[PDB]
């Protein structure tokens, strides 16, 4: 569905690349490059190397937050939508040409299901 069974843990940080998150629990299961919130914070630091291109940086940040620090509640996590995923393809093409999107950040419907509420 638009949710995935997981383990909820309390957010280590209330902040995701400049934005305050209106929830308290999260999970790392969507970010398949991170096995803890420490590594999540690490990989987000690396993602911050993109803020020299405000074009992509303004687009990719909701995506990064939705994937790396998603809202968890009752053993499930909110999955990022196809709509959100698609909006980053063009303005963040620099990511694709210089190293390439990780598989969990590519716009397949398994990671980013269409028609989410």
Ligand X SMILES: CC1=C2C[C@H]3[C@@H](CC=C4C[C@@H](O)CC[C@@]43C)[C@@H]2CC[C@]12O[C@@H]1C[C@H](C)CN[C@H]1[C@H]2C
Q: Is 42 annotated as a binding residue?
A: no
Q: Which helix (H) or strand (E) holds 66?
A: helix 54-68
* Sequence-ordered list of residues with C-beta below 8 angstroms from that of 72, at least 6 positions apart, any chain: 6, 7, 8, 9, 23, 25, 26, 27, 78
- The one segment of 15-23, 45-53, 73-81, 108-116 that binds ligand X by CB under 6 A: 45-53
Which residues in 5-44 contact ligand X (CB under 6 A)? 33, 43
Known binding residues for Zn(2+) are 12, 38, 58, 103, 110, 114
Footprint of ligand X (CB under 6 A): 33, 43, 46-47, 49-50, 94-95, 98-99, 102
């Amino acid at each position: 569905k638009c949710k995935k069974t997981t383990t909820c843990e309390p957010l280590k940080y209330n902040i995701c690349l400049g934005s305050v998150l209106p929830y308290a629990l999260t999970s790392t299961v969507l970010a398949e490059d991170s096995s803890s919130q420490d590594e999540v914070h690490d990989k987000l630091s690396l993602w911050s190397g993109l803020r020299n291109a405000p074009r992509c940086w303004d687009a990719i940040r909701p995506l990064l937050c939705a994937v790396y620090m998603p809202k968890c509640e009752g053993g499930k996590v909110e999955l990022p939508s196809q709509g959100l995923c698609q909006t980053t393809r063009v303005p963040c093409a620099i990511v694709a040409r210089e190293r390439g999107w990780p598989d969990f950040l590519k716009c397949t419907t398994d990671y980013f299901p269409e028609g989410c509420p």
